[PDB]
Amino acid sequence: ERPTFYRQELNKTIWEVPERYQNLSPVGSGAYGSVCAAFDTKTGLRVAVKKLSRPFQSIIHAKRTYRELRLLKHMKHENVIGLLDVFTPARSLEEFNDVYLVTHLMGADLNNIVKCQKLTDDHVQFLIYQILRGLKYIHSADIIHRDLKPSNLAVNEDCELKILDFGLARHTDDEMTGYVATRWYRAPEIMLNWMHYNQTVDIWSVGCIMAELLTGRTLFPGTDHIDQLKLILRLVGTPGAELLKKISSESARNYIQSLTQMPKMNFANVFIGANPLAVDLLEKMLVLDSDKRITAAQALAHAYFAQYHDPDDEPVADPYDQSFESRDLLIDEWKSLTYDEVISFVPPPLD
Ligand SMILES: CC(C)(C)c1c/c(=N\C(=O)Nc2ccc(Cl)cc2)n(-c2ccccc2)[nH]1
């Protein structure tokens, strides 16, 4: 019942995987793990396999490993990453130190797509429809992505899209500093730590992404946090008293009040020649007050997606128990929890 495993060294890390996975080649790495492409001989799919790096080295890491496996097991949606397989070479809990996560290899990310091919309005409609369809599902489980950006959106050759989170980097202060894509899609309340954030932080990200699909250019390519804020406030206007009250960070509030007040721009004069319905949706997504942003479910009913919208085929998630998030456990308790989840994994059917 347990498959046979074989070992190999790729870019100075050991991969020990079931025999079903062949032709492993490295695709990326970071602080939390490494990814390889492979051929799954069982299903006949090209796959991507993330090996987590020392998943139980700290409490923070062990809880993260549990969190990821729990999230990935729950996800059952066409526009979101699905777990094809999870495995470990360990034969018991006592020797359980390694976690490997398998999903479909899609072919490209959305950075590839915006860089290398011109998109018509129909392409923008279809790609953004799918992001929002997946986001509806994600948000219905009270899950916030928080790092929606083109490199976390995988796209096949028929422009079918999946939301994922490679999750290889730490998102430290340094990784978020300077002229960097890691910060250009973040809602300003997350970027500047204004307040406790909502799931519409992800709608801001969709707005930034949609703008970029329409123009071919980054919406807010700030050279740093403050420059990026300035670019944002030039477009959407400076906040009024109502939003200022909601900024619970007194330090952040003090700084924004130092800026000269600016009105919202005419978005038809920014997104020159775009579908007026695209421009209308953008204005509803790129609202500074996150209480007043359009939701994913609201946005799916917008006239821009009239050719794709089907309210009978935009499903929500099964209930997701996140009570673990408020729980303090030891490493070995997170480990055993994670081990139970690996052991109980049942793969999806191959249609
Ligand atoms: C889209 C959603 C929000 C459900 C999410 C997905 C996710 N993980 C992944 O996408 N995992 C992944 C990505 C690529 C590969 Cl090859 C294998 C696994 N999250 C993740 C990543 C790291 C830590 C915790 C959660 N969060």
Task: Describe what you observe in this structure.
There is one protein chain. By secondary structure, the chain is α+β, with helices and mostly antiparallel strands. The chain folds into 2 domains: 15-107, Phosphorylase Kinase, domain 1; 108-316, Transferase(Phosphotransferase), domain 1 (Orthogonal Bundle), CATH 1.10.510. The protein has 11 helices and 10 strands. A hairpin with a 4-residue loop joins strand 1 and strand 2. The protein binds the ligand CC(C)(C)c1c/c(=N\C(=O)Nc2ccc(Cl)cc2)n(-c2ccccc2)[nH]1. The ligand CC(C)(C)c1c/c(=N\C(=O)Nc2ccc(Cl)cc2)n(-c2ccccc2)[nH]1 binds at residues 35, 48, 50, 64, 67-68, 71-72, 75, 80-81, 101, 103, 143, 145, 163-167. Residues 35, 48, 50, 64, 67-68, 71-72, 75, 80-81, 101, 103, 143, 145, 163-167 line the site of the ligand CC(C)(C)c1c/c(=N\C(=O)Nc2ccc(Cl)cc2)n(-c2ccccc2)[nH]1. ATP binds at residues 27-35, 50. Its cofactor is Mg(2+). It catalyses: L-seryl-[protein] + ATP = O-phospho-L-seryl-[protein] + ADP + H(+); L-threonyl-[protein] + ATP = O-phospho-L-threonyl-[protein] + ADP + H(+). Belongs to the protein kinase superfamily. CMGC Ser/Thr protein kinase family. MAP kinase subfamily.
Structure described in brief:
With 351 residues, this protein is an alpha+beta fold. The protein is built from eleven helices and ten strands. The PDB classes it as kinase/inhibitor.
Report the total helices: 11
Largest sheet: 5 strands, antiparallel
CATH topology of the largest domain: Transferase(Phosphotransferase), domain 1
Ligands in the structure?
A: ligand L10
Radius of gyration: 21 Å
Q: Biggest sheet: strands side by side, in what order?
A: 3-4-5-7-6
Oligomer: monomer
Report the helical percentage.
25-40%
What overall geometry do the principal axes of the alpha carbons give? globular
Keywords: Acetylation, Apoptosis, ATP-binding, Cytoplasm, Kinase, Nucleotide-binding, Nucleus, Phosphoprotein, Serine/threonine-protein kinase, Stress response, Transcription, Transcription regulation, Transferase, Ubl conjugation
Protein name: Mitogen-activated protein kinase 14
Modified residues (Phosphotyrosine): 179, 320
EC number: 2.7.11.24
